[PDB]
Write a protein that binds this DNA or RNA. Structure first.
Length: 183
DNA sequence: TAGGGTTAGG
């Protein structure tokens, strides 16, 4: 049995009239829903326009994501890997991005090392191992861009990543300015 | 379009 967090998808952009029932009826097409709910105001009971669906297995989750775009109650919605309440605190945790920051990679790390680990998550468009433009010294971090934002989401929700023999930290890439506003 | 009375007590 895989962890609940990894078996759940956040469903954003829900139609004003989507319900626990209409949501379920749609996503059950890709698996056994162990949970399905529409978040709404506790006071007015008005829909907050988003919800979650949870499958019995991550394979069923992958099936659902491979079926995008998803239209529910006539509205195109936005299914996303569910980011934990804890991680939802980090800056840009909910951004739709196709690039990741990979920090703490050994000096002798080469592109093939990155591909050997990251290709399993999706089509890689660009790989950039950073160096100091002036000294030419390796800075110990890289950037990897994918063709699908879900590749990035599938990655950052995992805790560990082994590249060139050792663990490395992987986060959603924030722009120069986002990093600044994040400081 | 970020969570459902779901987060520090001898």
């Amino acid at each position: 049995k895989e962890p609940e967090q990894l078996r759940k998808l956040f469903i954003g952009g829900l139609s004003f009239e989507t319900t626990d029932e209409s949501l379920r009826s749609h996503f059950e097409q890709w698996g056994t829903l162990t949970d399905c709910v529409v978040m709404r105001d506790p006071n007015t009971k008005r829909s907050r326009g988003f919800g979650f669906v949870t499958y019995a297995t991550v394979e069923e989750v992958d099936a659902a994501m491979n079926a995008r775009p998803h239209k529910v109650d006539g509205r195109v919605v936005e299914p996303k890997r569910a980011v934990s309440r804890e991680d939802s605190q980090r800056p840009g945790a909910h951004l739709t991005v196709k690039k990741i920051f990979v920090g703490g990679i050994k000096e002798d790390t080469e592109e093939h090392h990155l591909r050997d680990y990251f290709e399993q998550y999706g089509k890689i468009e660009v790989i950039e191992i950073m160096t100091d433009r002036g000294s030419g010294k390796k800075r110990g971090f890289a950037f990897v861009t994918f063709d699908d934002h879900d590749s990035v989401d599938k990655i950052v929700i995992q805790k560990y990543h082994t590249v060139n023999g050792h663990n490395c930290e992987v986060r959603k890439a924030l722009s120069k300015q986002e990093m600044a506003s994040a400081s």
